Design a protein around this ligand. Sequence first.
Ligand SMILES: *[C@@H]1O[C@H](CO)[C@@H](O)[C@H](O)[C@H]1NC(C)=O
Ligand SMILES: *[C@@H]1O[C@H](CO)[C@@H](O)[C@H](O)[C@H]1NC(C)=O
Ligand SMILES: *[C@@H]1O[C@H](CO)[C@@H](O)[C@H](O)[C@H]1NC(C)=O
Ligand SMILES: *[C@@H]1O[C@H](CO)[C@@H](O)[C@H](O)[C@H]1NC(C)=O
Ligand SMILES: *[C@@H]1O[C@H](CO)[C@@H](O)[C@H](O)[C@H]1NC(C)=O
Ligand SMILES: *[C@@H]1O[C@H](CO)[C@@H](O)[C@H](O)[C@H]1NC(C)=O
Ligand SMILES: *[C@@H]1O[C@H](CO)[C@@H](O)[C@H](O)[C@H]1NC(C)=O
Ligand SMILES: *[C@@H]1O[C@H](CO)[C@@H](O)[C@H](O)[C@H]1NC(C)=O
Ligand SMILES: *[C@@H]1O[C@H](CO)[C@@H](O)[C@H](O)[C@H]1NC(C)=O
Ligand SMILES: *[C@@H]1O[C@H](CO)[C@@H](O)[C@H](O)[C@H]1NC(C)=O
Length: 340
Amino acid sequence: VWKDADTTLFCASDAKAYETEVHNVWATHACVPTDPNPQEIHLENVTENFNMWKNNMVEQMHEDIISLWDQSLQPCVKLTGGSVIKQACPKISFDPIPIHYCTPAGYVILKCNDKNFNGTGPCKNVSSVQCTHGIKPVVSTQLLLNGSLAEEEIIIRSENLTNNAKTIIVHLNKSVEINCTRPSDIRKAYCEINGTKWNKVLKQVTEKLKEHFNNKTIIFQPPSGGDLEITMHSFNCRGEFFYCNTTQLFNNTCIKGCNGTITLPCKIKQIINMWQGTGQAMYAPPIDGKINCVSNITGILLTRDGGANNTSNETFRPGGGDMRDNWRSELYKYKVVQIE
Ligand SMILES: *[C@@H]1O[C@H](CO)[C@@H](O)[C@H](O)[C@H]1NC(C)=O
Ligand SMILES: *[C@@H]1O[C@H](CO)[C@@H](O)[C@H](O)[C@H]1NC(C)=O
Ligand SMILES: *[C@@H]1O[C@H](CO)[C@@H](O)[C@H](O)[C@H]1NC(C)=O
Ligand SMILES: *[C@@H]1O[C@H](CO)[C@@H](O)[C@H](O)[C@H]1NC(C)=O
Ligand SMILES: *[C@@H]1O[C@H](CO)[C@@H](O)[C@H](O)[C@H]1NC(C)=O
Ligand SMILES: *[C@@H]1O[C@H](CO)[C@@H](O)[C@H](O)[C@H]1NC(C)=O
Ligand SMILES: *[C@@H]1O[C@H](CO)[C@@H](O)[C@H](O)[C@H]1NC(C)=O
Ligand SMILES: *[C@@H]1O[C@H](CO)[C@@H](O)[C@H](O)[C@H]1NC(C)=O
Ligand SMILES: *[C@@H]1O[C@H](CO)[C@@H](O)[C@H](O)[C@H]1NC(C)=O
Ligand SMILES: *[C@@H]1O[C@H](CO)[C@@H](O)[C@H](O)[C@H]1NC(C)=O
């Protein structure tokens, strides 16, 4: 027997002590080695209540990633709280590794295995683990990259679909590659996506949200203003902060002649708004050479337009900005409990 509890977790990794890649360096001194022989214990005929939108593993991971980024990235200047802070800005090696989150003695992690679990409510196929699976801490908006996939149907996760200010996490069951390159203006870049695979998946997503919104017409529109970090698909590739225009991916016409390669325009930005919320940071100009990152789109973050309770349409725009939802999309099936 066990009871819902909140304890400070520890982390584990297969990080290499000789690497200079910042994720390895941070995990080498802040996490322990992953258990070589992990044991997973299935709990026969037991049912447990999960709630992904009220999970303290979320905020613990958020804390870890903030600390990771603050020890790893070296901006030449940070304008924070009215306070300029200058320091050397060497280029770094950057490629996220999976991090495992683990319970201390006297606690354990309950794992939801219901394939179609949406993130809240009862789960009937429950297991017990000491650590979660290896989660890559990918920092991005609009598109969730390099995560895990939904096992059966595409899942729609939200704390309250009725409230349109609550973000909608869409868990894909089929990854779609995004291939972003700054070839050898040095900040010019672009991302290539297979149109036929994206639009097929995009159309499957519309039918799933049709299921949740009373078979209403689902419409995609690009962000309605805001900072470039959420108006564009922002992510970090090999240390460089990429901003990509995704209006070509949320086009309701193709859900005809759009079957080849979609090419998103991208820019590498030196001056950015921190996702930690601490203000602005300036980095050095990009490195020479082919900057390339091939990633899997495994989810989409959407925010639905409000005020359409009188009309026949529901309109959605790529959302994000709160990185907790990024960690939320991977920690949704885990919950901490105390042994009794
Ligand atoms: C419960 O989940 C496990 C692991 O995901 C999988 O074998 C199957 O879906 C379920 N197994 C049983 C015995 O219910
Ligand atoms: C998730 O499932 C629960 C039932 O356990 C339900 O109350 C809730 O509305 C569902 N949420 C979504 C987004 O489907
Ligand atoms: C991309 O997705 C495929 C499965 O769809 C997976 O096998 C592959 O390892 C993924 N690549 C990365 C970098 O996660
Ligand atoms: C993904 O889920 C949709 C339903 O949401 C289903 O129609 C489709 O066949 C699934 N695709 C795969 C590859 O599982
Ligand atoms: C969901 O959101 C609607 C509209 O914002 C609100 O009326 C309702 O109280 C919310 N439901 C829950 C369970 O929070
Ligand atoms: C990614 O794009 C570059 C240039 O567009 C190309 O050279 C490379 O082969 C592509 N990689 C994949 C895996 O599609
Ligand atoms: C797009 O993916 C489809 C499979 O859905 C495949 O027929 C084709 O090879 C791909 N085309 C491009 C340009 O990537
Ligand atoms: C939503 O649409 C499908 C159309 O096939 C239907 O089966 C389902 O019952 C509909 N639900 C409502 C509430 O209209
Ligand atoms: C994205 O590109 C479209 C044209 O395809 C343009 O109208 C729009 O202004 C761009 N987005 C931003 C945030 O500049
Ligand atoms: C996703 O994983 C691939 C393979 O590990 C890596 O090359 C790529 O940089 C990753 N994408 C991001 C945004 O970290």
